[PDB]
Design a protein that fits this description.
part of a larger assembly, 2 chains, A: mainly alpha, 1 helix, B: 68 residues, 43% helix
């Protein structure tokens, strides 16, 4: 058996979306935090 | 990059409450303790003597502590 290709398609879209989310969680503006004073 | 986005819930409300609590106890934490310090280091507590011969005291002058 195995996947149905609908599940493959769905899962590859979730590959793209989940990679984009977890890369977006990775912050580096060279400064995460900033104290005003 | 190495440091990811950590997800803490919130801290502002709690730090505001504890800031207000320490500040509004500190407003009368310093003067009351300093006042009782000045009382028990300057005015003195009391002394141990008795009622003299044929004499009437008040309802105070029975108590060791002067603020009491």
């Amino acid at each position: 058996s195995g996947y149905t290709p609908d599940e493959k398609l769905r899962l590859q879209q979730l590959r793209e979306l989940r990679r984009r989310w977890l890369k977006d969680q990775e912050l580096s503006p060279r400064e995460p935090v900033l104290p005003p004073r | 990059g190495k440091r990811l986005f950590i997800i803490k819930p919130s801290g502002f409300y709690d730090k505001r409450f504890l800031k207000l609590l320490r500040f509004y106890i500190l407003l009368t934490g310093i003067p009351v303790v300093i006042g009782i310090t000045l009382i028990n280091v300057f005015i003195g507590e009391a002394e141990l003597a008795e009622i003299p011969e044929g004499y009437v005291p008040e309802h105070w002058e029975y108590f060791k502590h002067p603020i009491s």
